[PDB]
Structure 1
Amino acid sequence: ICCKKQFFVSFKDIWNDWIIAPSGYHANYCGECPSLKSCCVPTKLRPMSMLYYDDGQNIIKKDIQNMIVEECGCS
């Protein structure tokens, strides 16, 4: 049955020099869905704040949307 697993990621692991903060984020991922087809997809999302660079030493801060998976469900 569809389940919200908690997967956390890193930035040097993938941007460590690009993104000032945070260092990483609780990302999470989505289980078994029944019969019309059903896949365990994300149903709820949260934004996350970021302190990174613009393009050429320009620091920025914006609340990026749909970057964290809050609650999964069936399609």
Structure 2
Amino acid sequence: GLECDGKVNICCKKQFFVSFKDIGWNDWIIAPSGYHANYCEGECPSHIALSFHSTVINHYRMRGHSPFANLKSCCVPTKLRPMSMLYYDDGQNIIKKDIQNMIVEECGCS
């Protein structure tokens, strides 16, 4: 997908870093101190809309056949990566775990 700069208008990935200290989560997250979560922003006009399932919806959208005639496309993550994390749990044990769905790696039009 596209990486947002300040020029591209269409759906892209915006770099976004989050400190656990700044948001007050470091009391239970020991490590890492922060990471690039990222997010998706941007337009999804007709001339673009894994896209495989979305593409077939888009092909149906190309005729006024009416579930998809109205269905607006959205810029959303199309790929997420996990990340290793150390944290306190309910019994306050320190746990090490590969946490799924932590980083947005790519964005796309639904």
Match of 1:74 in 2: 109
Is there any run of 5+ residues in structure 1 with no aligned partner, and where? none
Is there any run of 5+ residues in structure 2 with no aligned partner, and where? 1-9, 45-69
Q: Which shifted more, 39-48 or 54-63?
A: 54-63
Structure 1 residue 68, shift from structure 2 partner? 0.5
1:29 matched to 2:39? The reply is yes
Structure 1 residue 56, shift from structure 2 partner? 3.6
Larger Rg: 2
Query: For the aligned residues, what is the CA RMSD?
Result: 1.3
Q: Equivalences for 1:1-75 in 2 at 5 Å?
A: 1-14=10-23, 15-30=25-40, 31-33=42-44, 36-75=71-110
TM-score normalized by the length of structure 1? 0.91
Aligned-residue sequence identity (percent) comes to 99
More helix by share: 2
| Cα-to-partner distance string for 1:20-44 (whole Å, 9 max, x where unaligned) | 10000111000101x8211111100
Structure 1 residue 11, shift from structure 2 partner? 0.5
Partners in 1 of 2:35 and 2:99 — Cα distance?
12
Partners in 1 of 2:38 and 2:91 — Cα distance?
31
| Cα-to-partner distance string for 1:46-67 (whole Å, 9 max, x where unaligned) | 0011011112431100101011
**Alignment partner of 1:4: what SS?**
strand
